[PDB]
């Protein structure tokens, strides 16, 4: 069978604020930088993946421009990577240079923002959705006692309420930067505590930070890889109206969650 070993595939890459990985003005030359840009069908946002561990747009390979942090990510000649191990992509969508360990990062959220190789801190700005469907997935998030998450107190807080179908604030838009956003107001994000004294999960303006990166794991948890912890219901009691970040434990079902779209 030669369908188990597919030789290539062309697709887009989306990330911070749902903007796409884009080589600036379709420039051919080696070292031509790569940026955030609003998503479209143009040839310079098409990324073709290969068993070579390469990611190609305009017949040229995506690559970091320095061993140090802070330098641009570029496109260049694929002949120059002749004995290079290339890119590796984690389950959570962290695109990493295998040699330097630098990770694709968008240090701002606006159009024409230079993309750089930086050190991985598991931020939202370092999370990426490889795939043609770049849109936010509008969904409900069901948890303990079959209840839906709901944005509350003027989109500042979040806890469990009983699932009402029409209800606006129970719907969440899942972005390509691993962020869980309010569907009615997509400037706002689900965020872990900024205060050290609290472990309470709250809603804040999106800022590309570690606190707002969320992975929906196959084992049914909602993981924040930076803080090595998962969303949990407080004291496994939904009526306490508090969702908290906790170390992963099979004691209880407060750390089990479903996506329903």
């Amino acid at each position: 069978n030669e369908q188990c070993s597919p030789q290539q595939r062309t697709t887009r890459i989306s990330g911070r604020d749902g903007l796409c990985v884009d080589v600036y003005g379709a420039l051919t030359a080696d070292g031509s930088r790569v940026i955030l840009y609003p998503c479209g069908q143009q040839q310079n946002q098409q990324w073709t993946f290969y068993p070579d561990n390469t990611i190609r747009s305009l017949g040229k390979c995506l690559a970091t421009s320095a061993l140090s942090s802070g330098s641009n990510v570029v496109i260049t000649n694929c002949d120059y990577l002749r004995y290079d191990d290339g890119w590796m992509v984690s389950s959570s969508g962290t695109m990493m240079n295998k040699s330097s360990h630098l990770v694709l990062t968008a240090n701002a959220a606006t159009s024409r923002t230079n993309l750089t190789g930086e050190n991985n801190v598991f931020a939202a700005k370092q999370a990426w959705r490889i795939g043609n469907y770049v849109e936010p997935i509008v969904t409900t998030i069901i948890g303990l006692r079959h209840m839906c998450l709901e944005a509350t107190d003027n989109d500042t807080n979040v806890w469990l309420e009983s699932c009402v179908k029409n209800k606006t604030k129970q719907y969440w838009a899942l972005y390509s930067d691993d962020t869980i956003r309010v569907n009615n107001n997509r400037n706002l994000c689900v965020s872990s505590s900024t205060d050290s004294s609290s472990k309470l999960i709250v809603i804040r303006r999106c800022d590309g930070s570690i606190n707002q990166r969320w992975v929906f794991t196959p084992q049914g948890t909602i993981s924040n890889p930076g803080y090595e912890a998962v969303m949990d219901v407080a004291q496994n009691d939904v009526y306490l109206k508090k969702i908290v970040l906790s170390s992963a434990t099979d004691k209880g079902n407060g750390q089990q969650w479903t996506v329903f779209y």
Partner: protein, 247 residues
């Protein structure tokens, strides 16, 4: 055997049944980069079936034989009569429900063979506790008018729910709302593509989590969503286990 009586059929109980069903199917499962279990393969016929008991409003039970390799029904027992599909493994006859009066149904366990013979699609077959119970009865007496429709219902509510958390959650909503539903495009597209998604997701190892070909999974608004990689929450936090495909 793992059981689900309609006399004790809550959201909590249903979920516990489905959770345990997954666990038992994923014993000895292999694991890829996605972290979603892959079912066993080349399983000797003697160990290839998992028995599950479903009881109706009369305290009368059917025992279904689930092929552990693909999570489909090979046969079922009722009192001292057993009934096999044609496409069920040829040696299954000699291994399960051995001390019964065995029959071979005149069709295959696929939805296409069932819909052809039954004369009705999944789209026009309501689902729910009321229908779950009715299907167990009709399979127990084996009224052939209803046998095909009864498999549409039970395959979807047991096996396709085990496969997909979305489908599991469709049934949970129905339990708590006390209201029937006919499967939408979202549900049917997951049933359609379970086989294909298993292939692409295992081939994806080759291309850093990227598919060989896209798979259209519809949402509840009937908008298709292309899934051409492992980086979609609607695949990753939905598909519970997958069919073996690639070494």
């Amino acid at each position: 055997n793992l059981s689900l009586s309609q006399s004790n059929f809550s959201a909590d109980t249903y979920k516990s049944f489905i959770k345990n069903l997954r666990k038992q199917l994923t014993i000895g499962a292999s694991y890829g980069s996605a972290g979603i279990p892959i079912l066993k393969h080349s399983v000797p016929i003697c160990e290839r079936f998992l028995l599950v008991d479903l009881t109706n409003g009369d305290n009368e039970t059917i025992t279904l034989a689930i092929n552990v390799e693909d999570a489909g029904f090979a046969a079922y027992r009722a009192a001292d009569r057993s009934y096999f599909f044609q496409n069920a493994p040829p040696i299954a006859s000699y291994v399960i429900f051995t001390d019964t009066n065995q029959n071979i149904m005149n069709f295959n366990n696929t939805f296409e063979s069932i819909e052809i013979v039954g004369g009705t699609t999944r789209s026009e077959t309501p689902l729910g506790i009321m229908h779950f119970e009715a299907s167990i009865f009709h399979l127990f007496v084996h009224d052939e008018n209803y046998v095909p429709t009864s498999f549409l219902v039970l395959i979807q509510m047991v096996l396709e729910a085990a496969k997909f958390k979305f489908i599991e959650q469709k049934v949970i909503h129905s339990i708590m709302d006390m209201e029937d539903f006919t499967p939408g495009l979202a549900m049917l597209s997951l049933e359609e593509n379970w086989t294909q998604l298993s292939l692409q997701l295992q081939a994806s190892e080759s291309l850093n989590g990227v598919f060989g070909d896209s798979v259209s999974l519809y949402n509840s608004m009937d908008e298709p969503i292309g899934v051409d990689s492992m980086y979609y929450p609607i695949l990753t936090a939905n598909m519970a286990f997958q069919l073996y495909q690639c070494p």
